[PDB]
Amino acid sequence: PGVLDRLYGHPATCLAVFRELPSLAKNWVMRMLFLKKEFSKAQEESTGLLSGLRIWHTQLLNLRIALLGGGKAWSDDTSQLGPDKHVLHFMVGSPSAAVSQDLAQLLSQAGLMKSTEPGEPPCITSAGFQFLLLDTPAQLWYFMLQYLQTAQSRGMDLVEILSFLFQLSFSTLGKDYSVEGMSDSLLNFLQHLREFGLVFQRTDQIRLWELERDRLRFTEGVLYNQFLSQVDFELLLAHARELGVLVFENSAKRLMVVTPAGHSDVKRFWKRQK
Amino acid sequence: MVNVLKGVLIECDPAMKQFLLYLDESNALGKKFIIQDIDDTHVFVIAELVNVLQERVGELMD
Amino acid sequence: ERMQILQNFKHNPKINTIFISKVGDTSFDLPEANVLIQISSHGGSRRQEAQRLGRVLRAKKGMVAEEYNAFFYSLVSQDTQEMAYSTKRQRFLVDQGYSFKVITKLAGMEEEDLAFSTKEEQQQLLQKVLA
């Protein structure tokens, strides 16, 4: 048993060392998970701590019963930690951790209902800007939060949960864009919402790739330049289009050249200064 | 040499189709407006608004 | 002269390509080969292409039980009335049980000597054809 602290300690060390910048922690945290853990963990640096926090509840899945209750005891501490901490990476970590605590069923529905974290998931869910990666953890959190409630008889949270309704505008967007990944996440929210509270609530194709190619055909939107006063001003204005990579054509014997519309303005500015 | 600028569309067609567009330009009704000039055999300065028409007409035509 | 060319084509290992006009169809003993190229989509019948293919082509030795051991080609100019015949041709041959594909590029045609290497050469043919 004297060995136990030492071995696991070395991995605690490794995680500590490359704790700050990237996402090294995930694999190592898992190993750490098996072997007042939460109380002691709290002192350690946040990232990675959260990673360990995330995976440990997952890992639980007799003495096990004891473990769950023990975890339930300091669910608050992690919750206090979760907020306050609140990049995309961090954001992913906070909801992933929250989601994980939720499936454990340790979290108190009350308390959760009135908390910043629930506002934050729908906030990111609402905004178009968030990336697909943030979206999936946000979505998962919501799903898990609703999953946590297997009652709704006594669950204030299943009120705030209603915040999903706000999402429809977001789904309209997303749909407008070809973001299939952003739509699927929405559907999961809907389906899960219905699930919890459902009781309460009332060759041939060769011509088709050719027909696709008929919808693509080229030309470019473009400025032409002519009647240039002397050769040095063609060559300067031409070299300064070529380094901008927006020369479509050039002919030095014409003293004539062509720029596509996206670098009309960098040329209009260079023509004014020098 | 930044004497003159002209927004136009530069068409980079092949040495086969280009003359077809030219033909489109002439012998046509409400046309001849289409091509500003032939900068190269491959490229032409053309249209703007006409580009939709030129492409479509080429499509419809053989 | 036909029976000399056709005896040469069948027995002589030096005489391996010949060119033939519509006279092969309707009572004619076209010889055996393993490759058929049609320079154009024509107006004789999609069904006569399959009769002509079927009566001319056979397996090359050794490979007599493989997925293919003989070859048929039909050449089409893009952006012409020659293209219209394809959706019919394609449907016809696959309904006749044939494996059929479309080849749309040859970037190894850019690696060797072939005709019409210049615009001036192409112009020389263009003036002759127009006349």
UniProtKB/Swiss-Prot annotation, chain A:
GO molecular function, one term: ATPase activator activity
Range of residues in the leader sequence: none
Alphabetical keyword list: DNA damage, DNA repair, Nucleus, Transcription, Transcription regulation
The organism's place on the tree of life at top rank: Eukaryota
GO biological process: DNA repair; nucleotide-excision repair; transcription by RNA polymerase II
Protein localization: Nucleus
Cysteines engaged in disulfide bonds, as pairs: none
GO (cellular component) term, any one: transcription factor TFIIH holo complex
Domain notes: The C-terminus (residues 305-462) stimulates the ATPase activity of XPB/ERCC3.
The protein's assembly and partners: Component of the 7-subunit TFIIH core complex composed of XPB/ERCC3, XPD/ERCC2, GTF2H1, GTF2H2, GTF2H3, GTF2H4 and GTF2H5, which is active in NER. The core complex associates with the 3-subunit CDK-activating kinase (CAK) module composed of CCNH/cyclin H, CDK7 and MNAT1 to form the 10-subunit holoenzyme (holo-TFIIH) active in transcription.
Protein's job: Component of the general transcription and DNA repair factor IIH (TFIIH) core complex, which is involved in general and transcription-coupled nucleotide excision repair (NER) of damaged DNA and, when complexed to CAK, in RNA transcription by RNA polymerase II. In NER, TFIIH acts by opening DNA around the lesion to allow the excision of the damaged oligonucleotide and its replacement by a new DNA fragment. In transcription, TFIIH has an essential role in transcription initiation.
Family: Belongs to the TFB2 family.
Descriptive protein name: General transcription factor IIH subunit 4
Organism, scientific name: Homo sapiens
Curated annotation (Swiss-Prot), chain B:
Example of a GO cellular component annotation carried by this entry: transcription factor TFIIH core complex
InterPro entries: TFB5-like_sf (IPR035935), TFIIH_TTDA/Tfb5 (IPR009400)
Compartment(s): Nucleus; Cytoplasm
SMART domains reported in the protein's UniProt record: Tbf5
Assigned keywords, A-Z: Cytoplasm, Disease variant, DNA damage, DNA repair, Ichthyosis, Nucleus, Phosphoprotein, Transcription, Transcription regulation
Gene Ontology BP annotations: cellular response to gamma radiation; maturation of SSU-rRNA from tricistronic rRNA transcript (SSU-rRNA, 5.8S rRNA, LSU-rRNA); nucleotide-excision repair; nucleotide-excision repair, preincision complex assembly; transcription by RNA polymerase II; transcription elongation by RNA polymerase I; transcription initiation at RNA polymerase II promoter
Function noted in UniProt: Component of the general transcription and DNA repair factor IIH (TFIIH) core complex, which is involved in general and transcription-coupled nucleotide excision repair (NER) of damaged DNA and, when complexed to CAK, in RNA transcription by RNA polymerase II. In NER, TFIIH acts by opening DNA around the lesion to allow the excision of the damaged oligonucleotide and its replacement by a new DNA fragment. In transcription, TFIIH has an essential role in transcription initiation.
Homology family: Belongs to the TFB5 family.
Quaternary structure and partners: Component of the 7-subunit TFIIH core complex composed of XPB/ERCC3, XPD/ERCC2, GTF2H1, GTF2H2, GTF2H3, GTF2H4 and GTF2H5, which is active in NER. The core complex associates with the 3-subunit CDK-activating kinase (CAK) module composed of CCNH/cyclin H, CDK7 and MNAT1 to form the 10-subunit holoenzyme (holo-TFIIH) active in transcription.
PANTHER family tied to this protein: GENERAL TRANSCRIPTION FACTOR IIH SUBUNIT 5 (PTHR28580:SF1)
Listed name of the protein: General transcription factor IIH subunit 5
Protein's organism: Homo sapiens (Human)
Gene: GTF2H5
Curated annotation (Swiss-Prot), chain C:
Residues that bear Phosphoserine: 99
Residues involved in ATP binding: 55, 58
Protein origin, superkingdom: Eukaryota
Reported effect, residue 51 to A: Very low 3'-5' helicase activity, wild-type ATPase activity, wild-type damaged DNA removal, 80% decreased transcription (all in vitro)
Positions in coiled-coil regions: none
Signal sequence region: none
Helicase C-terminal domain span: 1-115
Localization of this protein: Nucleus
Stated role: ATP-dependent 3'-5' DNA helicase/translocase. Binds dsDNA rather than ssDNA, unzipping it in a translocase rather than classical helicase activity. Component of the general transcription and DNA repair factor IIH (TFIIH) core complex. When complexed to CDK-activating kinase (CAK), involved in RNA transcription by RNA polymerase II. The ATPase activity of XPB/ERCC3, but not its helicase activity, is required for DNA opening; it may wrap around the damaged DNA wedging it open, causing localized melting that allows XPD/ERCC2 helicase to anchor.
Misc note: The TFIIH core complex from patient XP11BE (a patient with XP/CS who has a C-terminal splice-site frameshift from residue 741 in this protein) reconstitutes in vitro transcription about 30% less well than wild-type but does not restore NER in vitro or in vivo. The XP11BE TFIIH complex has all the subunits in the same stoichiometry as wild-type. Purified mutant protein has very weak 3'-5' helicase and ATPase activities. In another paper the mutant protein has wild-type 3'-5' helicase activity. The mutation is recessive to wild-type. Conventional DNA helicases unwind DNA by binding to a ssDNA overhang of dsDNA and then translocating on this strand with cycles of ATP binding and hydrolysis to 'unzip' the dsDNA. XPB/ERCC3 is believed to be an unconventional DNA helicase principally because it translocates in a 3'-5' direction along dsDNA instead of ssDNA, thus it is referred to as a DNA translocase.
Organism annotation: Homo sapiens
Residues of the full protein shown: 588 to 718 of 782
